[PDB]
Structures are given as C-alpha cells and as structure tokens.
Design a protein around this ligand. Structure first.
Ligand code: HEM
Ligand code: HEM
Ligand SMILES: CCCCCCCCCCCCCC(=O)O
Ligand SMILES: CCCCCCCCCCCCCC(=O)O
Lengths: 430, 430
C-alpha cells in the first residue's frame, strides 16, 4: 500500500492519533488514505504505535493471523489494553507450550458443552429476576452487567453474597466502559487494582481452606491452575484467569444494549422472537430466532475493532511483504461486514443465521476471534456469550419489557472505543 | 500513618485517581487524609498504583530516598511517565554498575563546568534573537522552548538547520506539555515515536559517516556511548540519551513562563534584575540577581511533584516501617517549601538565594533531585537549567520586553500536571 500524505523524504505519519480520533472508523479511513475502497480486501500497510503494521481482512487475513508458525502474541497487545483488561500473566500473551497448557485448562471450564449447560439455568434465573427489578426504570447495560456477573459468579461456584457479586460485577463493567478512552483510562487501572486484590484474596482463601469451593467448580479449577510442567501458578495469575472467565461475560452487557436498540429498529424480529419464546412457555433459553438475532448483533455492532500479532518469520499476503518482528492486524469489524464473504454485508438481517448449524465454522465470522479455540487464541467463551446474549434478546423482546426509544437510547458514537448507547438503553417493566 | 476513610475490613482505597484529580495538591491532601497538617514532616503511607507507598519529606526523606544500598530505580517509574518522557533504555531506570558507567558519560557532557561554559554563548545568542522575534507578539513558553532547543542543539554540535531545530524543539515541548494529562497523553507517545526516529537516524548517520560531527562534540560522545564493559550501545539508546541531554533544556521554558508571571507579581525584583544587567552592558549571563530569582522560581513553582523508588531492603523512617519491594516517594514540591528547613517557606523571596555560594549543597533544595550527581540519579543538567532560566529572567525583566498581565497570563491550575499559564505568558517587544 501507498499513502500520498506527504513528501517521499518525510516519513509516513504514525496512525496512533488517527486511530484514537476515528475509533471504529479507523480501518475505513486508513484504507481510503491508501487509495482503496473501504469495501476492499487489499492489505493496508501503516506505521502504528511506532511499529510497521499491516491491516488484513477476510479469509486470507484470518489464515495468516492465526498461523502460529508465523505469528506470536507476546508483546503484540499494548499495555493500554492488556494491562487493565486482561491482567498480568494472562493467557492472552502466552505462546507455544505455555499457552497450550493454559488455554486447555481454561477451555475446559468455558468451552466444554457440559460446562455451558451448567451456565444456562443461572443466566435464565438472573435475567428473570432482572425483569422484575426493572419495574423501577433502569438501563440494559447496567442491568444485564449485574445479571451476567451474578450468573457467572454463581456458575463458577464462588461463595459470595448477591451484594458482593453486584459490587464486583459493577466494577468489571466500569473497567470495560472506561479503558478504551484516554480521558477515562486511569479509572480502568483503578478497577483493575481492586479487582485483582479482591480475586487474589479469593484464590488465597480457597488454597488455604478459609473459603470453601466445590472440588469440580470453576473456582477450584482456577485455584489448581498449573503451568506446562505441572507447577502451581501464583495466586495472582490464578486470580487473573478467574476474572478472565467471568468479566468477559459481564462484557456481553454491551451486546445486550446494542441488541435492545436493534430490537427497536427491527420490530418484526422482536415480535417473531417473542412468539417463538411464548411457544416454549416463555423460555429465555435456546430460542432459535433469538440465537440468530444475537449472532447478527455480534456481527454488525462494534466491539473488538481489530487484533494485533507479531510476525515470527518473513511472509506475505496478497503481494504485501511482511517483515519479521512487525505487527499484523486482523480487521475484526471489517471481516464481519466484508462484502466479499457476506450477502448484503451492510444490512442487519438475522435470517443469514437462521438454519446455520455451526456458526463457529464460518471462517469470516470472527467477532471473538478465528481459527480453533484450543490450538489458538480464539475466545473460549463464545457459547457462554451467545447464551447470555440470546437469553437477553428474548427478555428484551417481551412487550411488557419496554425499551426506550429516545435518540440517546438508539444511537451511539462510532469514533470512540468501546461504545454503546449513552443511556445504556433505558428500559422499564410494565 | 492511618486513614479513617472506611471500615477496617475494607481495604484502604488506592490513591491513583486522587493523585490525578488533585495534581500538585495531592501531597497536602493525602496528609490531611491521614490526620496530619499539610506542613508536617511525618511520613504518609498509602496505596498508589496498586502498590504500598510511603511519601517522605525533608532531610530525612532525602537521605533515605538516595541511599542506593536501600533503594532501586528499575521499575519504580510507571511507563505513563518514563515511556514518553525518558525513552527506552534511558539512564533514569538503570542501577548499579550499568547506571554508574552511563551516568558518568552523560555527566561528562552536561555537568562539567567546561561544557556548561560552552553552552552559555548559545543561549545568550538565541535569547537575543528571540527578543527581536517577539516584535510580533508571542508567548514565553513557546518562544523560549525554541530558543532553548536551538541553543541545546547547537551546543551539542548537531548539524541541523534552524528550521529543523525549531521542528524538533517544538515537538519536544509538545511532548512535555501533553504527557501528564490522561486526555492528551497519547499525543506525547506520538511525539516520542517520531522524535526517536529522527534522533536514531542521526546517531545512525554519525556512526556511518553520512552526518559530520566534531569528535569532541556532545553528538559524537553520544554516538560513542558504551555500556559498563566498553560495548557500544544500540543506536536507539544513544539517540534516547541524546534527547535526554537536550529535551530537558527545552523543558525549562516552563520555568521561564512561571518566571514571567513572577516578574509581573514582583516588579521590584524585575527592576533590580534589569539594573544589575544594565551595569553589565545588558548581559544576560551570570547576573547574580537573576540567578537568585531563577532559583526561587525553581523552588516555589510546581514542576516535578515527587519521585518514586523501590526499596531493596527492609528499613524505616521516623517510625514508619518500609517493606522490601514497596514504593518510596520523595515529596519534591513539599521539601522545597517545607517550613522545617526554609525561613518563610510559603513566601516567594529571592533574597534567600542572594549570597549563596553552593545552592547544590542545600540538602532540602531538590527541584531536580538530591544527593550527588555522579553517584546517584540527581539531574546532571542543573547548571545548564539555571543558565537557561536566569538568562531568560534577565531578558524578560527588560522593560521593552512587555509581559502580559491578564489573568490567563498570571494564574495556572495546581490540579493538573504538568502546568503553566494557559497562554504561556504572552509577551511583545516594543
Ligand atoms: C462480549 C463478549 C466477548 C467478546 C467481545 C470477546 C472477544 C474476544 C476476543 C476478540 C478474543 C481474542 C481472540 C484472539 O486472540 O484471537 C478473546 C479471547 C478470550 N476470551 Fe473472549 N469474548 C467475549 C466473551 C468471553 C467469555 C464469555 C469468556 C469466558 C467465559 C471469554 C474468555 C476469553 C479468554 C480467556 C480469552 C483469551 C484466550 C486466549 O488468549 O487463548 N470471553 N475474546
Ligand atoms: C526544567 C528543567 C529540568 C527539570 C525540572 C529536571 C528535573 C529532573 C529530575 C527530578 C530528575 C530525577 C532526579 C532523580 O532521579 O533523583 C532529573 C534527572 C535527569 N535530568 Fe534533569 N531536570 C531539568 C533539566 C535538565 C537538563 C537541562 C538536563 C541536561 C542537559 C537534564 C538531564 C537529566 C538526566 C539525564 C537525568 C537522569 C539522570 C539519572 O537518572 O541519573 N535535566 N531531572
Ligand atoms: C492495537 C490493538 C487495538 C485493539 C484491541 C482491542 C481489544 C478489545 C478486547 C475486548 C475483550 C472483551 C472481553 C473481555 O476480555 O472482557
Ligand atoms: C509516580 C511518580 C509520579 C511523578 C513523576 C514526575 C516525573 C516528572 C519528570 C520531569 C522531568 C523534566 C525534564 C525532562 O526529562 O524533560
């Protein structure tokens, strides 16, 4: 790629400030800045964070990004993100054998169908209680963040009161809501400090016998987390990874707020989801129309803009050379809405997921990563995430669960990260 | 120390957000929050950035902080500061033998009296040209940042045009002006990226023969920078340390803006400085009244709030225990204005420096560090800094150099870091 931004002698400008000012529009801006259409699939080379980087898209980009023989993750994610959001020693930054042993112990807890089945009754119960709590007006983001958190903490077997679960869920949701914007970024570190302290004392309590934990519970498995040689990990690392199995479910509240606005904008799907639920006695769980609607929300609405990796060897993609040690960025939002692999890519239409047997197998559907869960860095919690979101979609599609319709409930900024309706989508139960 | 902020079971709150909201008032706030007067010298224990920390003051605090047998600097400064401001591999983070060999090579360039004498004619010339440039109205911060930068680049022997010197000085001044506030913080990284690139290509040019450099010049000595075993350092490290010998002189523009406001607030000192200069034919250099005025500016006006170090062994100070591995913070602003070691500490009075032979020997005068330059981490550029500031004080004290008197020229916020008059002190030459 080539930018005609300045003279040949002057180095091409770093894109860090463009990225922050444009948010989820950055990929389309850096594309037209190199002379290609925002709907093109050609790689875009740039300087980002003082490092040569290539923005890739589509099936070719996914195949390159998740080839562990050519890509590493250690040091690819800036501390601005991984520090507050993932924590020290997290699986996100591990490679090779250390990652495989860590990722399998965590996929055992979040990705296995038996474990996901254990999560379903908790989120269903918490969402039903949230509907009753919403007789006093609230908003979807704050409300489902607490319901998701309580569901995750209960599912994990953590012996906390509902008051303590709410406190930790609220703090996780605040961390997510503040880390991506430089003005509020220090707030996310503040939450990370006290979350780490709260969860380290929990792992310390389970290992010493002060805090009871079912031997097969997620809490206990994290307290018994070992490295690739069978050695027990530090209490802080075990606490960091327990948060990584709970906080990202709290993060689904953002998808639930997006889904409330989409339900307002697509009332024929709301009624269709409601009717499908009523046929099942009103159940929130495993409603095919809601699952499809949830999937189209994950595809269309912005959350993860892109992901970084560092090249371990010289390679190339579609003619663009990639030097060893430089950054490779996979366009998440652009791949999910790529006209090259999606029919009517710019249209919100959940029908594209109706009748799909294995959405995970769609190689260009990567809102939470691509390739394989256990052999790569793909999110191991997609089944829990879709369970949380689809159940929330059903609850919000109830006509007695009245969603707000003001411009602050339905619109959001695309130039900030992360983003959501400013109100969080107001809601009240009749 | 003890905070009665919440219940005993609830952990004491981290002070990170209090520090950012209160800026240079943080030390006085954390003191009264522990039940002591803001003018007290007792140590204050706290949680800062998720780490137990002790804020020390006065002679006892200085003796503790600079005892290298009990304190290390590696990892004590957060990346929020050292990343943009100091650069990777800088002397600020080195300890032991690596620091001694690095610090002596840099003190040879900035701290030696012969080198400082070589700097004087450059800043005197640049300031005289700035006075003539100010026939078109400007401001002290922006103007002296360029004059100081050109003086430093010329003194160092860098073969750049005046246009290129201005460009790099402007970018250093922007970095300083933006790094301390979370909203503008990413701008400082942006400048650090292109400054590092500009100065790495300079070191690369000198080492390869593309760029000429006097063998005894500061530029050449940095291009020949070696580690503690005689091994040549990387081109980026040599470029990082060349910036550390030039950018901090650009930073003196902030003191020069403070000094302009002080000259307005203390007109009897302005006229006294002007008369002392006129007696010397109008010289800007080595005017005792201006030197004293410059020193009192460094003492009273806020720049460095405090400095961090990590304890290498268990120790104590005034009854407060210090655990190995925790943080120790030396109150810079509080020590410089401590009623325990300063007569009328809250009063701006340059007479306290009139007749002082060795201000460096005043143990509680630490605006740019304490203890010894070569054996510790004390600033090696205080003589250059005082030369730059005192010469600027003389120039601004000229009645034909008319300083602005609006509230935006004379006041500034104490709750932001770094800080200065919002206009930069407007100024115009008659
Ligand atoms: C809105 C909800 C979620 C979003 C947007 C999301 C997105 C992502 C993304 C983009 C990645 C990185 C993929 C890669 O590195 O290639 C990731 C990784 C991860 N996710 Fe999720 N995810 C969500 C929900 C969850 C849930 C519910 C869990 C656990 C129950 C979870 C646990 C993890 C873990 C542990 C990783 C690191 C895996 C590794 O590095 O190997 N996430 N997530
Ligand atoms: C307004 C101007 C300045 C201020 C506020 C300032 C302040 C400081 C402070 C507080 C330190 C750390 C002391 C410690 O770690 O104990 C420091 C270190 C340092 N300063 Fe300055 N200084 C200034 C001017 C200069 C100048 C003019 C130079 C060079 C010509 C310079 C070069 C350095 C270097 C290289 C260090 C690191 C030394 C080490 O870590 O051993 N500074 N400065
Ligand atoms: C240079 C890379 C910039 C883009 C980084 C975006 C990372 C977003 C991760 C979002 C993860 C949500 C789930 C969670 O961990 O709580
Ligand atoms: C936790 C420590 C917070 C305080 C850190 C303050 C550091 C300020 C350094 C200012 C140096 C100015 C000279 C320069 O390097 O350009």
């Amino acid at each position: 790629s080539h930018m005609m931004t300045s003279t040949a002698g002057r180095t091409r400008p770093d894109q860090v400030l463009s990225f922050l000012r444009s948010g989820y529009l950055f990929a389309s801006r850096v594309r037209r800045r190199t002379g290609v259409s925002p709907e093109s699939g050609a790689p875009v080379s740039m300087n980002l964070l003082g490092k040569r980087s290539v923005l890739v898209r589509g099936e070719e980009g996914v195949d390159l990004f998740y080839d562990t023989s050519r890509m590493k993750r250690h040091g690819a994610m800036p501390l601005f993100i991984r520090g507050p959001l993932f924590g020290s020693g997290a699986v996100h930054a591990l490679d090779g054998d250390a990652h495989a042993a860590r990722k399998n112990q965590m996929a055992d807890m979040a990705y296995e169908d038996e474990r996901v089945a254990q999560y379903k009754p908790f989120v269903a119960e918490e969402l039903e209680m949230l509907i009753r709590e919403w007789t006093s007006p609230g908003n979807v983001y704050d409300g489902t963040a607490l319901a998701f958190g309580r569901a995750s903490f209960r599912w994990a077997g953590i012996p906390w009161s509902r008051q303590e679960m709410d406190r930790q869920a609220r703090r996780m949701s605040r961390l997510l809501d503040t880390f991506g914007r430089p003005a509020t970024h220090p707030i996310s570190w503040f939450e990370r400090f006290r979350l780490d302290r709260t969860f380290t004392q929990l792992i310390h309590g389970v290992r010493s016998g002060t805090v009871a934990a079912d031997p097969d519970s997620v809490l206990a498995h994290m307290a018994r987390l070992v490295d690739e040689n069978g050695g027990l990990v530090d209490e802080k690392t075990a606490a960091v990874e327990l948060q990584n199995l709970t906080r990202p479910n709290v993060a689904v509240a953002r998808f639930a707020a997006f889904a409330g606005a989409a339900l307002v904008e697509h009332p024929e799907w709301a009624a269709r989801i409601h009717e499908a639920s009523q046929a099942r006695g009103g159940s929130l769980l495993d409603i095919p129309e809601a699952v499809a609607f949830a999937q189209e929300v994950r595809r269309v609405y912005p959350f993860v803009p892109m992901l970084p990796a560092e090249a371990t060897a010289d390679t190339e993609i579609k003619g663009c050379p990639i030097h060893k040690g430089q950054r490779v960025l996979i366009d998440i939002l652009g791949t999910n809405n790529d006209p090259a692999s999606w029919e009517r890519a710019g249209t919100f239409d959940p029908e594209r997921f109706m009748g799909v047997d294995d959405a995970e197998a769609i190689r260009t559907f990567i809102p939470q990563g691509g390739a394989e869960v256990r052999t790569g860095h793909r999110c191991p919690g997609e089944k829990i995430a879709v369970t949380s979101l689809s159940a929330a979609v059903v609850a919000l599609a109830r006509p007695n669960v009245e969603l707000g319709t003001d411009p602050d409930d339905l619109t959001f900024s695309w130039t900030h990260m992360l983003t959501r309706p400013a109100t969080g989508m107001r809601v009240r139960t009749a």
